[PDB]
Amino acid sequence: KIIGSGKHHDQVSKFMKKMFGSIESIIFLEDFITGVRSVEGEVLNLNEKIELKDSIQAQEWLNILDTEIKLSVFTQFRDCLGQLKDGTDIEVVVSKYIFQAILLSAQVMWTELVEKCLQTNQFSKYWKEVDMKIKGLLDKLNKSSDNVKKKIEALLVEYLHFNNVIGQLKNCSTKEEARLLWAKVQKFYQKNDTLDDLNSVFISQSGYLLQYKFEYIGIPERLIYTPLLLIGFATLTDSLHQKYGGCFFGPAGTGKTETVKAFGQNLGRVVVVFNCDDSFDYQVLSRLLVGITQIGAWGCFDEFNRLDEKVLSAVSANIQQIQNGLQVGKSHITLLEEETPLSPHTAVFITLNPGYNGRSELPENLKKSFREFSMKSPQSGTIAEMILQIMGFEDSKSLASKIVHFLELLSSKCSSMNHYHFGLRTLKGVLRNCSPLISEFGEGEKTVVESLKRVILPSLGDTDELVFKDELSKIFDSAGTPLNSKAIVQCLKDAGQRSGFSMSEEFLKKCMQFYYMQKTQQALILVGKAGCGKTATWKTVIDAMAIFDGHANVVYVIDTKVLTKESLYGSMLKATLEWRDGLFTSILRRVNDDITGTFKNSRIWVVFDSDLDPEYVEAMNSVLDDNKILTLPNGERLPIPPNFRILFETDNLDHTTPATITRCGLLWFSTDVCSISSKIDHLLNKSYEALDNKLSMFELDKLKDLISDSFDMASLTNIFTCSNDLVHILGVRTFNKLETAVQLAVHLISSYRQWFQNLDDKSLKDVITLLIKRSLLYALAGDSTGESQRAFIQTINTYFGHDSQELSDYSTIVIANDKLSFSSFCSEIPSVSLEAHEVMRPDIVIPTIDTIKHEKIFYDLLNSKRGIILCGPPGSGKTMIMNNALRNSSLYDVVGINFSKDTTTEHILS
Amino acid sequence: HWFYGISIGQFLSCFKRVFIKKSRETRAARTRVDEILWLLYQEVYCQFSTALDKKFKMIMAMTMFCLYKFDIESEQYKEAVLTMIGVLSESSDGVPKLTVDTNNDLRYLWDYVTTKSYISALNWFKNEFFVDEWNIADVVANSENNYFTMASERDVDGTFKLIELAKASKESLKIIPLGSIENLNYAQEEISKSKIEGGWILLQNIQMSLSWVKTYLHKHVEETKAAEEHEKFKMFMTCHLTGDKLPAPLLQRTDRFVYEDIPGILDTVKDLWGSQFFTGKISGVWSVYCTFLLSWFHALITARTRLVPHGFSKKYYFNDCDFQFASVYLENVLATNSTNNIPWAQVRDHIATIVYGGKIDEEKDLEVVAKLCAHVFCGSDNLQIVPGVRIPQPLLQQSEEEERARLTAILSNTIEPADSLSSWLQLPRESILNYERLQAKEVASSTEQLLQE
Ligand SMILES: Nc1ncnc2c1ncn2[C@@H]1O[C@H](COP(=O)(O)OP(=O)(O)OP(=O)(O)O)[C@@H](O)[C@H]1O
Ligand SMILES: Nc1ncnc2c1ncn2[C@@H]1O[C@H](COP(=O)(O)OP(=O)(O)O)[C@@H](O)[C@H]1O
């Protein structure tokens, strides 16, 4: 395509990202090349414009541009260093030069100044000067544009490294210790008396020298400088001095590849990263290796420990060839069945992840040419202080020490739990949530306290909350208060009492915690046993925010485990080469692509309302991370807008990885949000509003008054406590049987509304009480043996009043159209006779008292519009009783599905 | 283990040798059948123990002694030794049924085991075979094969032993290291011409070229049965027990044995110090002194690596690459800096963390390396690395050759005490006793499991 693009010369800019790795486009002029621009967005202006005639090949002018960009970077560096040397503020020079040039000029000037400072041992003055520079950069960051903000942040990272080193040098007691510390720190120098400008600047660490190749790097994600990072740099430069390659091994997520890339950036190189175990072809890798050898770039094998055995052997042979050529000093090595030149600036790095067997090591042929090093997670305190210094926090050292001490204290005192993770990741999450809170309250200790209470506190259990509170009081001297209280609390109360929910202290506490957590977090997890109120909590908060802000809400409730990964994320027809959307990506595209609907002024919620497993979430881990992009296995890479928020409603995290818990805002429901006599009232109101559409006014008011005052929690609390004494098959706690009790009671009451108008008040109350007793018995003790059912009947007749009509084992309201009395009866015992030829049909049943009672209760449960579960030993008669109850009626048709050891979800649909 | 494979043909040849070997008239075992059975046991242990490492050598010796004495001796001996192995293993405990004046050698074994001298107790069974273990001289001379595999761990290489043998065995050992495709082609040409010229050839570190051996060497050695009809040449292979699994037919075709010879600390110091000046001096006197100290430190760290988990939690193989990198750093720091000793403080922190502490992934082992470096390098005009030697700092005239001679003399003057692993190294003697008890427990458990099976 490039070869055929020798006339327009504008199709190369698409592949500039691939062939340069750092620059995304070439900024053109009407017939000249006026510069380049990187992926982050930054105009590098070439000093000498490149003419482009039509006859010139793409190869020739690309070749001249390759040197021109490096010469331009060196020119920017030299101009910036000459400017800063004639003392001028960093703020006025940030706007002129690219990030790399100002970075290198700052590093060289810092090294030059601190050398003489170490000679004279007067560190306080330069430390204060650097601190003032950092404060100036910090205040200029607030007034920065979209492009300059990244550059300012990177310069802040490097300047805080400078100040850290100067402070450590100042604290050193002896000159020997100061020089020991200065040896490890990566120093920068330039030779003022040399030709070949591109080789003027070099880097000295531990006495080893490395040339600075001036390849443009852009404005990359700078890593925070920590004493464990500089040890990685020292190991890499020690390996590179002796021409050995560079191997890192350690736990995943310790930034091995990022450390290699940061080392390359400091040296001015862009590191070509070969990603492994991504169905990575070998031939393309061999081509990349030949390119690395011929150019001289640094190639890093990311996750090298995961490769096919034959592919691993082939690539290890190639790497050994390259390394042998480098060590010997020979040129024109033999690989790819070809002799190719080998530039002596080539280098190979490898990063090995821990496998299933534990530790992973290099192949045998590479162990004699690679110097392995073990990477570890950084110390919490050092980078805690560094991040607090990234923000405008005062007393950042004391704050970081207090935060780390509080976290360790919590880990030592709080009760052990699966999701209790107080490592470095929790610290970084606390700081990231503390970052946006700076707008509301300043950069004091109370901001950290509020972030801790908004991150750690919700995820803690009930017994550990008091520990959190008292340790927070006794560690942090000041305990703050939250703002924006009255308005959102009143709005939550409105949105809850509108839906019937009871605004208890616990429910309001959980709603407030969820609201504050979703204020900043994007991925939410709600954990708690079935019936705690996760759905009620988040729905109430959604309604409250809709009423408060005025933004509309769009909710997509998806059950993850019902749908396979192909349906949830997207399926590709490998035999026909079409990609299908799936469910999650379809509703993401409907958000990004469409604008006619209310999608910019509305908050999108995707509630994964099912148990989560690592396999499902690993396909969206990029969404959970700071990337905030959904990376499909093939297709467009979808950006999630700020309104798009993912919630996870589950009941356990026994299979969710620590990474997902740390990234996602976790809200743990340690107890039910409402008491028994609040769920009962909510269900009563939800049934009254359903009956309201098919009933008169006064009759309904009187009936609901009778239902409400007929039972009281004083008598029912003893019943609910006694129900736990009974043995329950397929046990479910009574807080979940309340729904069945209330719904069945209300339906039974409503089914006899015709016989209530001409009914006396006393008999009406007796009817309501008897039906309530029946519903309570068949909901609480409905899954008992049958003798324990009689025991529960005695309990019911004891704890209710002694005047209401007693409930017997067969007490049923039978109503005759010729009489007005309720006429409650029991124990009919009918009789039936059948012929010989009817002895076995799938619909012949001998009616006994047990059969009639079971059929009656089953039909009453069906008419209550609630699902039923008949649990019993084989041959007991569950199917027979259903089919008899539904054969008599002309309203229901039975569809019998027979589940087996594995009935897929499409069996039911079929 | 993938290396201890045994075939019916080898066993039958070993049994044939029982009759073939009309050796010295052994103990008078009455009937000829008993004497033949004893000779069979002796020959099996003498031949098939070379292919095993030290722990499995002990296991074989104990198990075959038990198998022989469960038939030759009485029940008062059988239950005695069964309970004896139960005592040696830490799984069971009790007193054996010691019959006085009837089982004397068992009483010597009881004296050994009560004194908690596990190594002598385990070597008692080897001593009871009254046979001298075959060295590589015996194996190479006696076995009528042209192929031998020399396995070992990654800490010790027996290439020097094979060189010394073949220089004294009829001609020209020829080392052919593997590696890149150049090494592979050079090796194939060398073997193709050496099977005709007859010189002994050696193939260092087969493992790295596994894919090559699976394709070239395997079918070659399986098909070159006319090599015995070629000139009398011997092709050797060096592997690693912890390395990758060699193909089964290739290993079965060739003879095998395990090189188990760990040199003493002083021996390693002497070897390293001798080898350092063979390549010639690089810098002045202080470079020589620092190279001597580095040799001492490398020997100490390698010796402590052997112990596990004593000294170090894992067997971190500190090869010669670490020594080369540390030597390069020492030359650099003594070149850029001055003659004075001031930068010792940064000689440690680089050696203890970057070159020798890079492989380390646990904090305890890093602390071990750091304290070892602090002990070895921090010195003021008189350094006592081990309680038996004192190293004075260089002279004032700075005569480098005299300094090298003096260091050689101070190496030759001292001798290694038998308790060096507790005195020369910093870990206590009770640690060594616990280590030995653990290894004896492993041996006893394995042999009991085998006997029960
Ligand atoms: N504040 C409240 N006052 C009264 N009743 C409430 C309150 N909150 C919840 N409930 C009752 O508790 C029920 C819990 O329903 P919800 O769907 O929220 O449960 P959950 O714990 O998330 O469980 P699931 O795993 O079944 O989704 C509600 O349907 C309602 O009947
Ligand atoms: N009252 C009854 N009248 C007639 N048959 C009964 C009665 N009680 C139990 N049975 C017998 O019990 C068996 C239960 O069958 P089925 O309903 O298939 O078991 P399940 O309900 O466990 O699937 C029936 O075959 C029926 O013949």
Ligand SMILES: [Mg+2]
């Ligand atoms: Mg729910």
